[PDB]
């Protein structure tokens, strides 16, 4: 099966209202940058972002010029003429609109509350999709928590029912309308809805994991924002999944959730695969087309895992633009983030940046010894390891944020398409390295094990292993006269073949 | 409120059938040993043991000569003439009858299975109570498994209903009929029903904790069977409670159940106090009137914490009675147990035993250097700290197993009564020591705290404290944007 290549395409309202394809100071990355050849490299383009309004319906930001909106969307859907497999989805949400303290947060929470609100919201999603010519719906609420998850799931199931009927109604069986969501790529946010992952994923074609932003100025130690595997020398974190309402024992939680652990791409993927009912084919690994920068880093380790003096507030509080060579940063007024396109230019501008590589995390980083800067980002080389990981783990594909941050020639997208589809690219001998792998084992991903059947009336010693009722069990202490599963003395450690 | 002093009184069937108050070799401790002065020192005498028969009703052992039984029981209830607050309860169960592999085990499991079996069993408890003249019911099932707990609870609720009805019917408002159970005094067995403690305790006047047998031949290292507090030099144990079906988070479980931990009396009491709805006034601390003996011990620490060669099998697998001076051990064919009465007699027979004291656990023990023997037991001195502990923790009182093992002078019972009631006994200066205390914190014992009220819309860093819905919470990590109870980043750490 072809690996999905899902590229989000972010275009702010101000840009939609002044859309032009001949002035990069107004629209840095117009749709015209995507040629028929680049259109062929993508399976999905997710237009970002639509929102949920106070009427609790899917809608464009009110400030959007509707005619300019349709026009930008038409330029994207026209790309389908060059790729019969391409879908132009729209994404609802994003950090600014839907974070807990976001401008439209209450609308997300309220829309999923009842059967009536869910039906009215779902219907608006299908109406917007058909009105503008989209091919599916992507939900990017960052993020529903505990009490809101059941509504969220029911909202997804209702959208799924409406889209499936729409597919039949429009005779779109060859290219069915799709539903996806962008999910947390780190344990802290993932802990909010983790216990119900199987239900959340059931109605989706894919869950796009935001496996990046695992590092940033809001953290005290500099680190790679999307390390594939862990580096023992890098910082580790409390595993928040241990606090999810799973109703598992202390032994089960401890075994399933190693802690502290390395916040990596592999960790997020394995955490999703751990849960029974979450198919690998639906998991899509996100990669960033931008980097995050830190200033004030100590030397010696290329700036990795160092204390720093980077403001962590949003918006950027200063007028001081300290990321050398980043003119995009001055225009956008934030020296802490830069598109790959700009970072590649900085590497070309002979500014004193050393492009370094961590062979454990399999990711590049920039170090500016002279000024004490550190930049974590991804490139065509780190993408080789992530693409092989994707094939090896049988994931559904790759997703990236966002199309508009690739360089002018679209090399990052081209690289991804190449790793999955080029006849002349061969990664059979690519060495995945010795970086740290995440190996939590829970009640949902138990290995096959072999042990003598349990014998009623027998007394067992601590550590004894018996098979009973489909599982292999182990005693946590001595003199067990209870049957496996009838009391807290036995730990479920394996499955019977 | 006077502290309860609950003395279990065990009289095996052969002794009832051959009851005599004139022949110590037949009935070592007949009722006549309980003089009026001793009767005034007890609040309850729990006659042991009755059982549950195949008809799934409470009943005396079949081999019991009923007339002799009523005679023994009548002497007990006659004692009430000397103490108007005294209750003569009967206990159903015991290790032999009710343990998982015990002879009547199935009857316990089946009696609590259905509403009909539960009504029939409950009704039989009250009938036996009124028929033989008892003042209450004590259930000592060791122990209901997790799956059998809901039936156990309904059974207790049903007996409670019928006993309160009988109390009104019999005009016993002054001395209401009571219902109690003897509960596990260690985390391994306690973990079977720990999650439903509150429901198990609601229908009871008291839960009598068997906070003893925490050490014995079945363990690889000799240890005190009833240490009040822990000794860092002794063995430690896996805290089975962290595996109970509580539905709590890793943080909550870890803070409530440190592991490994010291298996002590204080640990069992605190473990009970950690659950919401288990009032201290209902918790009764059990103490043993007997010692446990080990052989083949090594020197160095008076026999403590040593490897040993004591058989762990029941019945004792041998006719080798190695407990020097223990004549009673030969009579009962087990040199691994001895009553306080016999231990005392072993001490005055100068057989080479040394009475030592551990000031961490606050308990005595014997050490026989020549034969490499170790004996863990309790006495009037260890009872001073446990009685003070009972007063400090506001527990319901003390319970002991069993009256028939006290000495002829009734020194152990006298000591318990003295510590709670004597006008001339002053323990205000008694030093509880530096032995290890159980540090677990749970729902039932959150410490009083104060903190800024949670503010809707505020982001909190890691470790921030706030008050919300009556409790004080703390964040487990940073950048918290939602409310306590609505975001698992918050840990309920205190209260009002
Ligand atoms: C409408 C608006 O808020 N406009 C802002 C704009 O906000 C952006 C940026 O902060 C994006 N950051 C970067 C590094 O591109 C941010 O990207 C988020 C996105 O919200 C999340 N959703 C996904 N998906 C895969 C669905 O990935 C994450 C990414 C990456 O973290 O999105 C917000 C809007 O929600 O920022 C620009 C520049 O600062 C500003 O001028 C203004 O246009
Ligand atoms: C019917 C029977 O098995 N009779 C045995 C008798 O068994 C006794 C003894 O083993 C008791 N042990 C000691 C040290 O006294 C044992 O006491 C148990 C009791 O079952 C549990 N219940 C409580 N409560 C407070 C309710 O405490 C524990 C105690 C202490 O572990 O009980 C069994 C019967 O269940 O043993 C004697 C020889 O000692 C033998 O002759 C015979 O009569």
Curated annotation (Swiss-Prot), chain A:
Reactions catalysed, as given in the entry: Random endo-hydrolysis of N-acetyl-beta-D-glucosaminide (1->4)-beta-linkages in chitin and chitodextrins
Gene3D superfamilies in UniProt: 3.10.50.10, Carbohydrate-binding module superfamily 5/12, Glycosidases
Residue ranges occupied by any GH18 domain in the UniProt entry: 40-423
GO molecular function annotations of the record: carbohydrate binding; chitin binding; endochitinase activity
SUPFAM superfamilies, per database record: (Trans)glycosidases, Carbohydrate binding domain, Chitinase insertion domain
Pfam family membership, one: Glyco_hydro_18
UniProt-listed GO biological process terms: chitin catabolic process; polysaccharide catabolic process
Domain annotation Chitin-binding type-3: ranges: 436-496
Keywords of this entry: Carbohydrate metabolism, Chitin degradation, Glycosidase, Hydrolase, Polysaccharide degradation, Signal
Transmembrane segments: none
Signal sequence annotation: 1-39
InterPro entries per record: CBM5/12, CBM_sf_5/12, Chitinase_II/V-like_cat, Chitinase_insertion_sf, Glyco_hydro18_cat, Glyco_hydro_18_chit_AS, Glycoside_hydrolase_SF, Glycosyl_Hydrlase_18
Active site: 142 (proton donor)
Binding site for chitin: 66-67, 93-96, 143, 210-213, 401
Cellular component terms per the entry's GO annotation: extracellular region
Family statement: Belongs to the glycosyl hydrolase 18 family. Chitinase class II subfamily.
PANTHER family in alphabetical order: CHITINASE, CHITINASE 12-RELATED
Protein name: Chitinase B
Source organism of this protein record: Serratia marcescens
Encoding gene per record: chiB
């Amino acid at each position: 099966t072809r690996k999905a290549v899902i590229g989000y395409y972010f275009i702010p309202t101000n840009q939609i209202n002044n859309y032009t394809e001949t002035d990069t100071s107004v629209v840095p990355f117009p749709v015209s940058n995507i040629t028929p050849a680049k259109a062929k490299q993508l399976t999905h383009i997710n237009f970002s972002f639509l929102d949920i309004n106070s009427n609790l319906e899917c809608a464009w930001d009110p400030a959007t010029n509707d005619a300019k909106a349709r026009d930008v969307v038409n330029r994207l859907t026209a790309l389908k003429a060059h790729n019969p497999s391409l879908r132009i989805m729209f994404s609802i949400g994003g950090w600014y609109y839907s974070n807990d303290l976001g401008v439209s947060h209450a609308n997300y929470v309220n829309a999923v509350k009842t059967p009536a609100s869910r039906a009215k919201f779902a219907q608006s999603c299908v109406r917007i999709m058909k009105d503008y010519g989209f091919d599916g719906v992507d939900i990017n609420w960052e993020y529903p928590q505990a009490a809101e998850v059941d509504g969220f799931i029911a909202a997804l199931q209702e959208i799924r029912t409406l889209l499936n009927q729409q597919t039949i109604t429009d005779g779109r069986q060859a290219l069915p309308y799709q539903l996806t969501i962008a999910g947390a790529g780190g344990a802290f946010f993932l802990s909010r809805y983790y216990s119900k992952l199987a239900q959340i994923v059931a109605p989706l074609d894919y869950i796009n994991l935001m496996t990046y932003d695992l590092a940033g100025p809001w953290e005290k130690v500099t680190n790679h924002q999307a390390a594939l595997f862990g580096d023992a020398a890098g910082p580790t974190f409390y595993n928040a999944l241990r606090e999810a309402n799973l109703g598992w024992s202390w032994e089960e939680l401890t075994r399933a959730f190693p802690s502290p652990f390395s916040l990596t791409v592999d960790a997020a993927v394995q955490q999703h695969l751990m849960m029974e009912g979450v198919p690998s084919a639906k998991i899509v690994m996100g990669v960033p087309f931008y980097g995050r920068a830190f200033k004030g880093v100590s030397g010696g380790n290329g700036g990795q895992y160092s204390s720093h003096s980077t403001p962590g507030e949003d918006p950027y509080p200063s007028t001081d633009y300290w990321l050398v060579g980043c003119e995009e940063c001055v225009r956008d007024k934030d020296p802490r983030i830069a598109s790959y396109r700009q970072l590649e230019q900085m590497l070309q501008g002979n500014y004193g940046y050393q492009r370094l590589w961590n062979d454990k995390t399999k990711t590049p980083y920039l170090y500016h010894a002279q000024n004490g800067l550190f930049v974590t980002y991804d490139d065509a080389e780190s993408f080789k390891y992530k693409a092989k990981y994707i094939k090896q783990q049988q994931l559904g594909g790759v997703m990236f944020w966002h199309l508009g941050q690739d360089n002018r020639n679209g090399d990052l997208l081209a690289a991804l398409d190449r790793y999955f589809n080029a006849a002349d690219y061969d990664d059979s001998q690519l060495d995945m390295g010795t970086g740290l792998r995440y190996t939590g084992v829970g009640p949902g991903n138990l290995p096959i094990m072999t042990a003598p059947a349990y014998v009623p009336g027998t007394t067992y010693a601590q550590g004894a292993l018996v098979s009973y009722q489909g599982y292999v069990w182990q005693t946590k202490w001595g003199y067990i006269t209870s049957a496996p599963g009838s009391d807290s003395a036995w730990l479920k450690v394996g499955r019977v073949a």
